[PDB]
Each structure stands twice: as C-alpha cells, then as structure tokens.
Design a protein around this ligand. Structure first.
Ligand SMILES: Nc1ncnc2c1ncn2[C@@H]1O[C@H](COP(=O)(O)OP(=O)(O)OP(=O)(O)O)[C@@H](O)[C@H]1O
Ligand SMILES: Nc1ncnc2c1ncn2[C@@H]1O[C@H](COP(=O)(O)OP(=O)(O)OP(=O)(O)O)[C@@H](O)[C@H]1O
Ligand SMILES: Nc1ncnc2c1ncn2[C@@H]1O[C@H](COP(=O)(O)OP(=O)(O)OP(=O)(O)O)[C@@H](O)[C@H]1O
Ligand SMILES: *[C@@H]1O[C@H](CO)[C@@H](O)[C@H](O)[C@H]1NC(C)=O
Ligand SMILES: *[C@@H]1O[C@H](CO)[C@@H](O)[C@H](O)[C@H]1NC(C)=O
Ligand SMILES: *[C@@H]1O[C@H](CO)[C@@H](O)[C@H](O)[C@H]1NC(C)=O
Ligand SMILES: *[C@@H]1O[C@H](CO)[C@@H](O)[C@H](O)[C@H]1NC(C)=O
Ligand SMILES: *[C@@H]1O[C@H](CO)[C@@H](O)[C@H](O)[C@H]1NC(C)=O
Ligand SMILES: *[C@@H]1O[C@H](CO)[C@@H](O)[C@H](O)[C@H]1NC(C)=O
Lengths: 313, 313, 313
C-alpha cells in the first residue's frame, strides 16, 4: 500500500526528530541551587619577602569570586598631613603660592588644598600642597611583582548542585577513602572529579598570556555546566568545565583589573596606614545547569500534538 | 475572486503579526555571562578630617555590590573590660547591686553581667555592669556626616557580556585612543558609552532624595539591559541603563541600610578597636540581557504551524 | 442529543484542565530583581573573651552571603622569619642538614627552605627550616570554640522584589508603626512578616545537627520563593521560606567549610599578624520568584488553539 510507506516515512520523520532529538517527553528545570567553596594554595616571593594566600587572595572567605594579587604599588607610612599633590592632578602644578587657592577640593585629587606651593617629591617642579593621606601614592609608591609563581598556584573549587523539583543532588568530589584529592591533577577525562586547578592551566584554557594578565590584571570565568538526564543513572550527571576571559581584552581606556586597599596601624598614637594598589586576576566561578526527567503530562500533550500534525499531514 | 481577498487578509494578519512582531524566526538566549568592575572616585570632608574612597567604599574590590558610607556613629578606644550596659537593653537599668545577677548573657546586650550596679555614662541613672567591648556605643559614640559631597562622587561601571551560544561579546566602553573616558559625562543618548555616573544622578533617576537616603541609608539598583538582535550589526547591541531603589521606602520598623565594622589596634600590648556603625547607599549593578539570532529550524517549525493555522482557517 | 453530551464532556475536559490548572490566560515573568540586606545579632563567649558580630560575621556589609564563625584555630605573633616547617608537609622531616636543600619552595608548604634541619616545635623530631610567616599554624595554633550560643543568634533578612514588566513591588516587612520587628519571632503562619530567624531554627529546618555543622562548618541556604498571582490583590503575594543545606554532607575528603584570615599589627616597627583559620556556617539567601498576570494576547491565542483541538476532536 502506498499509504503504508507514506505514513511510515511521515511518522519516523516526526518521531525520531521530535521525541528523541529534543526530548519532548521530559519536564525541565533550568538553574540549580549551587554552593561554591574555594581555597587557593601557593606562596610567592618578592625581594626578601614571602607572600602567603592570606596576603594575595582577597576576599578570604572562599566563595565564588576572589582576586589573586599579582602586582602591587604600595605606599608606606601614610598619615593625615600636608604634602605636595600628585603632578597628575588637574591644576596641581604651581609656580608660586598665588597659583593655589585654599579650600578647593577636587574629587579626583588626594586632599584639601592649603594655599601654598611646595616642591614636588621629585624635583625640580613644584605642586600645590594638600591636606590628606600623605604622602600620595604617585610620589612614594614602590612596585612589587608577586606573580612569578602564580601559574603554579592551585585552586580547589567544591561544588554541589540541587534541583528541588527532581530532588536531585550531585557534587564534583567523589566519596573516596584514599588520598585522591591530595595527589590528583584535574584532567577533563581521567580526573574530572579532582577539581583542583592550576592558575596557569586556567589561563591557558582562556587563551590568554599569564604575563599580560599578571601586570594589568583581568577576570577569568570558570564555568561549570551540569547538563544531566535524570531518566539515566546519577553516574551520567557530570560537570563540564570551561575557562574563558570575561573582561574586555582590547579596551585601551580601561585595560585590566585593579583595586586599592590599606593596612592601618598606630605608631606612637598616630593612625598610620600602608596603601596598596593591587593588580590581579579575578576568578568568577559561574555554574550553569539543565536537568530533564520523564513526565507523563508533557509526553501525552506532545503525543497529541504530533498525532494532530500527522492527521493534518 | 473572493477567496483571493479573504486569504490575502488572513495571511497578512498571521504574517506581519507572527513572524515580525514576535520574531518567530529567531532562537534566543536569556541571561548573558557578565563581568562588573566598579571604581568610585571622590573625597569628602568632616570636621578636620578628609575621607577617601578606601574609607567610605566597602568592600574595596570593585565588584557589582558595594556601599558608599554617608554617615557613621563611631566609638573609639574600645577594650575588653567592665562598663555600664546600654540603658536601651532589657532589664539593664538598676537601682542596687541586688537587681543585677551575675553571669546573665542577653544576646541583644553587649556583654556578660558582673552582678554590680554602676552609674551610667550620662547621669543620673544607674545600669547593670557588663564585661565586653567597652565602652558601649550607645554611651560613647560620636556621629559624623560625610555625605555632604557624595552627590558629586563618580562611579565607573565597566561591563562586558558574553552569549556563549551565539559567541557574541560586547562591552560598554568603546575602543577610543583619545581621552574620552577622562572628560566625559554619561548621557543616555550622546554619551551612552561613558559609563561614569554621579551618585546624585543615580539618586535623581531612582526618584529619591539624597538627604533622606544619606542619613538612613538605602539600596539603589543600577540596571543594565542588553536587548540585542544579532541578525543586525553589533553596533545595534547597546546597553540600556535604569536606576531604581530596591529596598522598601515606607517600612518604619526597618527603614534604611546600615552595618557595623571595627578597626583593631594594639596600644601598649592591649588590643583596642574603634567600632563604626555605618549608614550608606548600597549600589547593586544588575545586568539583564536577551539576544536573538535567526535559526532555520525554529523558522521552519513556526512556518509549518502558521500554514496549519491558515489551512484550518 | 448525543453530540450535546459529547461536546459538554470534551469542552469541560479542555477548559477546567487548560485555562484553569495551568493558567493559560496569563503572561509570566520568571526571576525578579531582589535586594537582600542582612544583619546578625548575638554575642558569644570563649575563655575570658567575649565575641561580637563584627568578629564572627565575615563579610560585614550585610548582604546575601555571609559566614558565622563557630570555631577558630588561631596562630599569634606571626612574623617573617625562620622556623621549623610543618611535619605535615612532604619531605619536611629531616635527620641532618644534608636532607634539606636550600631554595626549594613547595606550594603546599609554608615558606622558603634554608638548607638547615632544626628541632620541631614539639620534640623529639626534626624538620627542615623555612623562611616565611613564622611560627607555622600546625605548631603554634590554639583552638577556640565560639559556637556555644550560636543557635541563639538571630539573623534579620530584609527582601524586596520587583517585577519590571508588571511594575509590581513587595517586601517581606510590613508597614507597622508598633514595635513588631523588635518583639517578634518568625512563624511561617502567624509571623511570616517578622523575617528574624534564629540560627538554630534554620539548622533544624535544614535537617542538620548544630554541633557537627559548628565544628566542621557548612553551608545552609535560606530560600525565599515569591509565587504571586497579580490578577489577585497584592495581599496574596507572600514569601515562602525554605531551609536546606547546600554543601555535601557525606564527602569525607572535603567535609565542611573553612577559610583563613589574618590581623596585621606593627609591634616595634615589625609587621606582625595573627592568623585565624575559621570554621563556620555560611548563609546563602537565595530568592526565587514567578509572577502571573492576565494578558489578552496569550488568552486569545490559547483559546484559538483549544478551539482547533475541539474541532479536530
Ligand atoms: N570611578 C572613577 N571615576 C572617574 N574616572 C575613573 C574612575 N575609575 C577609573 N577612572 C579612570 O578611567 C581610566 C581607566 O580606568 P582604570 O581604573 O582602568 O585606569 P587606572 O589608570 O588604572 O585607574 P587609576 O585612576 O586608579 O590609576 C583611568 O584613567 C582612571 O583614572
Ligand atoms: N539580627 C537581628 N535580630 C534581632 N533584631 C534585629 C536584628 N537586626 C535588627 N534588629 C532590630 O530591628 C529593628 C530594625 O532593624 P534596623 O537594623 O534597621 O534598626 P536599627 O535600630 O538601625 O538597628 P540597631 O539594632 O543596630 O540599632 C531595630 O530595632 C533593630 O534593633
Ligand atoms: N586549593 C587547594 N589545593 C590543593 N589542595 C587543597 C586545596 N584546598 C584544600 N585542599 C586539600 O583538600 C583536602 C580537603 O579540603 P579541605 O580544605 O576541606 O581540608 P582541610 O584539611 O580542612 O584544608 P587545609 O589544607 O586548610 O587543612 C585537604 O586535605 C586539603 O589539604
Ligand atoms: C584651573 O583649571 C582651569 C581649567 O583648565 C583653568 O582655567 C584655571 O586657570 C586653573 N586655575 C588656575 C589658578 O590657573
Ligand atoms: C610550575 O613550576 C615548574 C617548576 O617547579 C615550572 O617549570 C612550570 O613552568 C610551572 N608551571 C607554570 C608556570 O604554569
Ligand atoms: C527581667 O525582665 C523580666 C521580664 O520583664 C522581669 O520579669 C524581671 O523582673 C527582670 N529582672 C529583674 C531582676 O527585675
Ligand atoms: C556638584 O558640585 C557642585 C559644586 O562644585 C554643586 O553645585 C552641585 O550641586 C553638586 N552636584 C550634586 C550635589 O548633585
Ligand atoms: C623528596 O620527595 C621525593 C618524593 O617522595 C623523594 O624521592 C626524595 O628523596 C625527597 N627528598 C629527599 C632529600 O629525600
Ligand atoms: C536559646 O537559649 C536558651 C537559654 O537562654 C536555650 O535553652 C536554648 O536551647 C537556646 N536555643 C537553641 C540552642 O537553639
């Protein structure tokens, strides 16, 4: 019968292509509840100085977002007082006391102007004197590179996801009594459940240079995808790891990532601070997920729609 | 032919209204990967005191969420020791040593009770003595307003989005060799790609008063929407900026935003701290996005559905 | 008429089951803009020491994610210098100076090796000497439990959601002139709008033991669901609170949550720090929401589809 072959072709076209490829027989949940616990390990050395994780990882609480400091411009022994203003500030440069007016407070400056013209930190120029945190970084900062051994650092990312509808839970570390998580190196295939990543590895998979990113700074995403079919065993629900840079790489106006922080002390009853401008690599751990599980209602509805299409066709 | 006009009307109704208005010929991705780098600039003065960004912006790392401090209640020279308890604490007020019992520890109090009744910081009342961080803020705090020039502060928000499916990337700062990002003021039309916002501007677009929000505190969202049609040039994919308050504005029980933080020192071998209760404006940078790009599969499926509807009709 | 009863049955089956149960007459927005302001209250005591919220809550800014410290391993008077390395570090243990080689820098160690073998902190063993932050925690740390009264702590979670499409806004605290938010205890039914939760309560609703979670640490999600039908009064749009643990509870390799932070001082011109390893309970406040409101377009489209199905059937 010609109709036999015609309908055999029609059915298979709308069966193997509708209920198989796109899984019309499944209800879905997009976006699981996730916990990210992070921990960085590794120590680096500058000139007669050893840096530990506490110093170069900020914030310290071990969450999804953190910055590993690779370079600092540090200004020591900063106290409230009078000092020459940065030559980089508008109208700062002066030739006589008459060129500076008292009380003026530029937002982009570094204090309140005194009405005097004082010699700059490095001569021979002169610059308007201000009251504020002194000395200013643009005249007393020292640079330290502490990203020399940062490619050898290690980050442990612990993730556990939950799909409330399906009541499904899976983590990225296996229940193993041996010391696997202490002698293991992540491999997307052989060691997918050792979620310990070197920073150099992460920077290689984002397609970036460790040197450029260590001097200007930047942001690298670590993306974990949980695309699981629950009609199958939980052993098939596994994490997929992706590494890409998130911040612009061609923007010349703002090229990189940086932040300032200070350390406050009291020397002889005077509040003193060391200001640090930190360039570093920020690590975003972003978690995506999509679970699918058989449900009778959607299956029946889609079967009815397919039967209607067959009847029309 | 009457059928000619009938079908001409029917088709246009389900063509210009189905594949044009709602763009049935497009696959979509909702929710891009985003990076937010923030930086606040501006300095403010209190009584013989200049405040910089490091002091009034917390946390300092330059992310999506940060608080600009506008007012502080500060308690200086706090040490572990004995002091009268706040008159604001239940059962704290006493007339004789018999009214206070030793060892009691109220969670809403400020230390461990000693069993004695001592004069309050400001007379003539008496209050039960406690062991803890002393003196208590409700008896030794001084208030400082540092939001006087906060409307003139500036926030630079750098955003770059990524749609992995489409492999589309766009940022909110243009590749310009000139010093545009150094002499530019955001304008939703003329300067949409100078993402430098004054706080006063943000507070005007949220419909709020800077004074009320500076004394009680609050939360303002900065919403960036990326609604892009990829069938068009990337020059059509642009950010849309919105400013609205996120926290309740009529709640009298909890009206505002505040947090406490302390600064720890060691004076003569004794751990001493200055406790700061900070009221301020928290800035949430929230990023929404929806990209659409032509795909043949959805177009064919929707065309088949439209043809079926036409056939029935 | 038989057809009368047949169509009466058919219609009700596809009316009470299509436009009622699944609300086909509604357009939807999934995912509202939310603000979370948190504040923890409660003080705890260790041996001759009173801890306040500033010490045990990190970070302090009052956001969606924060950690309440329950146990610390603290190492005091740490200075850059030479000290024996932790016996827990590979190859650290030595019998003579020849077993240690100078310059070697293990990432999992605690400094730079000097080439000498020195007695360990606790005898009789000997371990290779390193330069770094000294002494090392594994030889000078003291443990403090400060989770004794943590179940009695209180967390105030303030939430306000916004659905931009519907321009709908609702918060979780009512506009009440009385002191309700000062004498109230959350009850999912009687006091759903007192969003002040004890930590013990939260840990009881997650199904966990406060002791196990206080010594190893962990992560508890506080989930707020806003499932609102806008065709009804705003008094029907209410929060639904759920409490569940987010981190794995059977993983032996990594069981818990911890982070390290340090406190920096200057004693006699020398930078000195107290390193704290903190175990605690991290609180994730996660907000889900789904609003539905009548729209004519979807209603007409779904009615047309239902009529087509009826005609075919
Ligand atoms: N909050 C802000 N307000 C105004 N201008 C800013 C702000 N943040 C940065 N800029 C300016 O924009 C340009 C690019 O920003 P970026 O912070 O990357 O550069 P920078 O030179 O490293 O910053 P800095 O001013 O700290 O040296 C710089 O010239 C910087 O001065
Ligand atoms: N974690 C908490 N547990 C119990 N009560 C709280 C908590 N946080 C705030 N409150 C109380 O709820 C009310 C409103 O909160 P809010 O913090 O806005 O007020 P406040 O007076 O500024 O707070 P504070 O108690 O720090 O003075 C205040 O009376 C405050 O004491
Ligand atoms: N970033 C990291 N790189 C390598 N190994 C790690 C890292 N973080 C943790 N580990 C190791 O994995 C195991 C489990 O992690 P976890 O931090 O829970 O244990 P821990 O013993 O409390 O950590 P610590 O090493 O601080 O004592 C521990 O043996 C720990 O040393
Ligand atoms: C300050 O800058 C403005 C703008 O360049 C300039 O016109 C003015 O002369 C400057 N002030 C002085 C005292 O020169
Ligand atoms: C890790 O350290 C080794 C030497 O110990 C070095 O050869 C290697 O390049 C480092 N890995 C990097 C830089 O990614
Ligand atoms: C403590 O407060 C309770 C409740 O108000 C009160 O009954 C009790 O008398 C108070 N304690 C003393 C010693 O008065
Ligand atoms: C910015 O500063 C000017 C004075 O320099 C002031 O007139 C203006 O009101 C400020 N902007 C505000 C408060 O939004
Ligand atoms: C260092 O460790 C390796 C690996 O266990 C070992 O082979 C080597 O002998 C150790 N170094 C010394 C000096 O023993
Ligand atoms: C709260 O404190 C009381 C004593 O004041 C105690 O009995 C109770 O167990 C505490 N709640 C806990 C531990 O959840």
């Amino acid at each position: 019968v010609l109709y036999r072959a015609v309908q055999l072709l029609i059915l298979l076209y709308f069966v193997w292509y509708v209920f198989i490829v796109q899984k019309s027989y499944q209800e879905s949940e997009t976006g699981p509840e996730s916990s990210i616990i992070t921990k960085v390990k590794g120590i680096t050395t500058s000139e007669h100085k050893v840096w530990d994780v506490e110093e170069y990882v900020k914030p310290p609480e071990g969450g999804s977002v953190f910055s590993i400091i690779t370079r600092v411009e540090a200004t020591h022994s900063q106290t409230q007082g009078t000092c020459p203003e940065s030559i980089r500030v508008h109208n700062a440069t002066c030739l006589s006391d008459a060129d500076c007016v008292a009380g003026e407070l530029d937002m982009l400056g570094n204090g309140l102007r005194t009405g005097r013209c004082v010699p700059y930190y490095q001569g021979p120029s002169k610059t308007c004197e201000v009251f504020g945190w002194c000395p200013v970084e643009d005249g007393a900062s020292v640079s330290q590179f502490l990203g020399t051994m940062a490619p050898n650092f290690t980050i442990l990312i612990k993730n556990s996801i939950h799909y409330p509808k399906f009541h499904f839970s899976k983590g990225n570390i296996a229940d193993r009594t041996d010391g696997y998580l202490k002698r293991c190196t992540f491999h997307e295939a052989s060691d997918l459940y050792c979620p310990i990543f070197k920073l150099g590895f992460i920077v290689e998979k984002a397609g970036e240079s460790f040197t450029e990113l260590a001097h200007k700074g930047g942001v690298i995403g670590v993306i974990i995808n949980w695309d699981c079919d629950l009609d199958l065993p939980a052993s098939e629900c596994n994490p997929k790891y992706s590494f890409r840079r998130l911040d612009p790489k061609h923007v010349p106006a703002s090229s990189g990532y940086n932040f300032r922080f200070a350390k406050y002390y009291k020397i002889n009853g005077t509040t003193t601070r060391t200001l640090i401008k930190a360039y570093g690599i920020r690590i975003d751990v972003i978690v995506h997920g999509q679970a699918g599980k058989f449900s009778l209602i959607p299956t029946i509805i889609n079967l009815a729609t397919a039967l209607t299409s067959v009847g029309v066709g």
